[model samples]
Target: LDSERDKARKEVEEYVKKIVGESYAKSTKKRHTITVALVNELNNIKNEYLNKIVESTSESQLQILMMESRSKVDEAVSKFEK
Candidate 1:
């Protein structure tokens, strides 16, 4: 009647104190990353097509070139989804 109710946390803390550094402390410190080489390379090649369209298309026909540029842009953007 004098003592506080026992805590499940106390039992868990006792086990963790004994098993410290066995499971949670075994991971290696390292860095992993991906390069944007494919995106950059393909994007530059795609820009070449867009640049040609800009150079050849007439200024009065802006709508036609706009559609062409958007189509090329869509294809380049699609490659990055996977």
Candidate 2:
């Protein structure tokens, strides 16, 4: 139960890292360093929210939190891409 939620958080963080890394790779070199910092910041935000959700929500509600967080990260990625 708790372990499953932990695993879900790990998966979400890893996916965000991959998405952010790839997005950073596509960006201009001039701002690449800045983008790297942005990626880390985004990951931090995701992890913070995941921790909060896990602490407050039930196992069944975790999936919804995961989906919501993923969408938020996706939006962050898209914003960085622009």
Candidate 3:
């Protein structure tokens, strides 16, 4: 389970890197704005996505919810793939 969860985290992070990389390239000479946007997007995930999964739940329920949430995140970000 630990390894599977780690794999999910890596997949999500990889997609995030892809989006942020494109955002940075699109920014051209002004990359800070792109970087800031990337940071904000990640913060949003931590607060909105991660927090929602972990909140108001028992340990077992939290694990199930986390797996489900990661799956959704995986599906959502996969659209950005080339």
Candidate 4:
């Protein structure tokens, strides 16, 4: 029943991870660009979060993705911590 929403949620995680993953190397490429990519992902998630809220979408999963997006940034940057 919820598969429709659940499936997109799963894809969102993978997509963010994939982008962050590339950004994982981005630290090496030039930490400056982490801004470029992280901004993309963070804003991307927030945009989706607001989209759902406005359209009256699911309750938790989308917001869950929002939090996960933040943690994803933390890991990406904190890992850069040296």
Q: Which of the numbered candidates is closest to the native, going by highest lDDT?
A: 2
lDDT of 1 at 4: 15
Prediction 3 TM-score vs. true: 0.47
Q: 1-82, model 2: which lDDT tens digit per residue?
A: 6877787687677778787777766779788876886688677868776786678557776666677777778787777666
Query: How much does each candidate deviate from the true structure in C-alpha RMSD?
Result: 26.4, 2.1, 5.8, 9.5
Question: Candidate 4, residues 5-78: lDDT per residue as tens digits?
Answer: 45445555565667666566656644666556565755566456445544535555654655565575566556
Per-residue C-alpha lDDT of model 1 across residues 1-82, encoded as one tens digit per residue: 1121122223323333333223224323441111243335344544554454445534444334444544544454455334
- Model 2, position 38: C-alpha lDDT score: 65
lDDT of 2: 0.74
Clashing pairs in 4: none
Which portions of model 4 miss their true places by more than 4 Å? 29-82
Candidate 1, residue 66: the lDDT equals 42
Ten residues in sequence with the least summed lDDT for candidate 4:
1-10
Model 3 Cα lDDT, one tens digit per residue, 4-80: 44444455456556655665666556557546755565445545544544354445554455556455545544543
Q: Which ten residues in a row have the lowest lDDT in candidate 3?
A: 73-82
Ranking by TM-score: 2, 3, 4, 1
TM-score of each: 0.34, 0.76, 0.47, 0.42
